[PDB]
Design a binder for this molecule. Structure first.
Ligand SMILES: Cc1ccc(C(=O)Nc2cc(CCCN(C)C)cc(C(F)(F)F)c2)cc1Nc1ncccc1-c1ccncn1
Length: 290
């Protein structure tokens, strides 16, 4: 791709390193570290996530982070794709990529923490279920990720590692697709022939759906991921319905796991379908609408 070579609109993206208050670490990789920070005037004060290139990084590592920055800029804006807010690329400090901060963390861990705080739907008095998750929340998250993937697809992208661990949750129940840089999430064609396409991302989306409606459980419980797993997968064996799913959502997972990639729904069809399911669920209770 050589994305690092793309023109850089510094007036639009460059942020002064001295306008950042660096905080607690959020993660680390071969590239360096990601830390939480407060930025002033990146749009006031706003909390952000900063991916920083380690000192003494190799040329390939440096090139890789710059590439990621240019790719994020190329992709463009979408509510459900982690928002790039700026970068620090000029001399005087490390290369830094700045994104919005999602306070609730990854979806897998978050959902897991709400297992004792979930009900299919609230009933008045609703304060008995304050901050509880409901089927509406779960369908909503599913819908948003589909919207985000439909967007990435429209921009000719292939995610390749779609999973709950790569989805962050921000305020107002808005989720963001990320790629922090996965056999249980791979389509058969990917496992056996290393083939990656938007349709294999759909298969992974199906696993993500299972993760969502199991409230953060690990895929394929009780199964060792080995040649026997691959044999049975290719044969048609699929995960059973998760504990918090609806019949419609489970069939959607099955659809996403069709053996033939061309027969799996497209993200556009998933957006349509999940949107309808969400609307039906959101307007179902007429209690407050007399
Ligand atoms: C700072 C930063 C920079 C870039 C990204 C990120 O997802 N980048 C990225 C990069 C790419 C292309 C490059 C992929 N490489 C494998 C890295 C695609 C996406 C897409 F489209 F899938 F969303 C996303 C996440 C983050 N955020 C982050 N990273 C590591 C740990 C924790 C966070 C975090 C915590 C809370 N709030 C926001 N970010």
């Amino acid at each position: 791709e050589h994305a690092e070579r793309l023109p850089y609109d510094a007036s639009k993206w460059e942020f002064p390193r001295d306008r950042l208050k660096l905080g607690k670490p959020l993660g680390r990789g071969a590239f360096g570290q990601v830390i939480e920070a407060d930025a002033f005037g990146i749009d006031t004060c706003r909390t952000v996530a900063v991916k920083m290139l380690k000192e003494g990084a190799t040329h390939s590592e440096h090139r890789a982070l710059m590439s990621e920055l240019k790719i994020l800029i190329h992709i463009g804006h979408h509510l459900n794709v982690v928002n790039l807010l700026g970068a620090c690329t000029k001399p005087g400090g490390p290369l830094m990529v700045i994104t919005e901060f999602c306070k609730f963390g990854n979806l897998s861990t978050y959902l897991r923490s709400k297992r004792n705080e979930f009900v299919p739907y609230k009933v008045a008095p609703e304060d008995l279920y304050k901050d509880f998750l409901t089927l509406e929340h779960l369908i909503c998250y599913s819908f948003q990720v589909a919207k985000g993937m439909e967007f990435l697809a429209s921009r000719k992208c292939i995610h390749r590692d779609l999973a709950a661990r790569n989805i962050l949750l921000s305020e107002k129940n808005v989720v963001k697709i990320c790629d922090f840089g996965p056999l249980k999430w791979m389509a058969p064609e990917t496992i056996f022939d290393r083939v990656y396409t938007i349709q294999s991302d759909v298969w992974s989306f199906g696993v993500l759906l299972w993760e969502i409606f199991s409230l953060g459980a690990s895929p394929y419980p009780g199964v060792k991921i080995d040649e026997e797993f691959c044999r049975r997968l290719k044969e048609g064996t699929r995960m059973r319905a998760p504990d918090y799913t609806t019949p419609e959502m489970y069939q959607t997972m099955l659809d996403c796991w069709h053996g033939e990639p061309s027969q799996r729904p497209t993200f556009s069809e998933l957006v349509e379908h999940l949107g309808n399911l969400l609307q039906a669920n959101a307007q179902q209770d007429r209690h407050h609408h007399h």
